[PDB]
Design a binder for this molecule. Structure first.
Ligand SMILES: Cc1cc2nc3c(=O)[nH]c(=O)nc-3n(C[C@H](O)[C@H](O)[C@H](O)COP(=O)(O)O)c2cc1C
Ligand SMILES: Cc1cc2nc3c(=O)[nH]c(=O)nc-3n(C[C@H](O)[C@H](O)[C@H](O)COP(=O)(O)O)c2cc1C
Lengths: 154, 154
């Protein structure tokens, strides 16, 4: 079989973010490399959630979600590798719209309201309608994921 | 109005590619920063097409499309800025699946078959089923778009 299709994606640089929500009282988040702007009028953003792993379910059952933009590699690792029950013990967060956690170490975030979801193959596209966003820290180092690694920008 | 939501995206680094198709004999392509992997089984890839500009129509009416991965900044500018009738005069290309053009200066490409399209707000999500991909050049410099500019990776 051609699994050259995975090898090409591993060399394709992608921006990363951490999406959180409050899921019936349970604080959850995850590192994503599928976040993007989908539409400007109306202002929709989206990301892709893995259905096999059940990453889609939390966001399908909540009304809001926050996109956290940060430059601390360690946080990306926490929200990809640590057990789900341990994630919010180790970091500083404040509560935001609908109880959703905003990471303290974010340089920016966007709060959004779930707008639609769409199952395509083994992922769902989760679309949210933007309702606010703030730039908090002005001086930061944006990161990209490529080949299991995070790179600063040249 | 909050157009802080545009200012946040301008600081968010994104991978770029050029998607082409053969549209009823007309060779068309465009620079996109919305290309990503959507699903592994089945292997689907996608990008977002601006409906206001009519970028969606070519891909909705063709059976295939090619994703071209390249490290030549000049090509990204050609396939974003030059009039549509002038694009394929200025560069070297070969014909591929379904007549779709493959750019000669690509280090990799993926050929794909249209699988579905979905209108959300002012964009459509164009999903294609991967049918091949090849890594051609081994030594390249992947680029990311941020703030109207292209950066090498540090
Ligand atoms: C950089 C990186 C990118 C990721 N992107 C996504 C993604 O966009 N969508 C997704 O569902 N999971 C993605 N994941 C996996 C989730 O982070 C992970 O499945 C989620 O945190 C739940 O954790 P668990 O599988 O360990 O329970 C990514 C992981 C890493 C390392
Ligand atoms: C880096 C960059 C990213 C772009 N990404 C997209 C995109 O993902 N989807 C889209 O429809 N147009 C995108 N465009 C615009 C298209 O390249 C452009 O509209 C297309 O080439 C048709 O050209 P025209 O509007 O000049 O006729 C992007 C442009 C640039 C500069």
């Amino acid at each position: 079989m051609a699994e050259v299709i995975k090898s090409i994606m591993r060399k394709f640089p992608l921006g990363v973010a951490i999406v959180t929500t409050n899921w019936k009282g349970e604080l959850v988040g995850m590192t994503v490399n599928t976040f993007n702007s989908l539409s400007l009028n109306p202002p929709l953003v989206s990301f892709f959630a893995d259905r096999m792993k059940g990453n889609d379910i939390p966001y399908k059952e909540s009304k809001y979600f926050v996109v956290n933009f940060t430059d601390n590699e360690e946080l990306f690792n926490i929200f990809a590798l640590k057990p789900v029950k341990e994630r919010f013990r180790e970091i500083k967060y404040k509560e935001g719209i609908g109880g959703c956690p905003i990471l303290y170490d974010s340089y920016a975030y966007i709060e959004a309201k779930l707008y639609d979801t769409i199952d395509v193959g083994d992922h769902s596209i989760i679309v949210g309608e933007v309702i606010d966003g703030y730039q908090i820290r002005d001086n930061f180092t944006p990161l990209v994921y490529m080949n299991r690694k995070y790179y600063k920008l040249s």
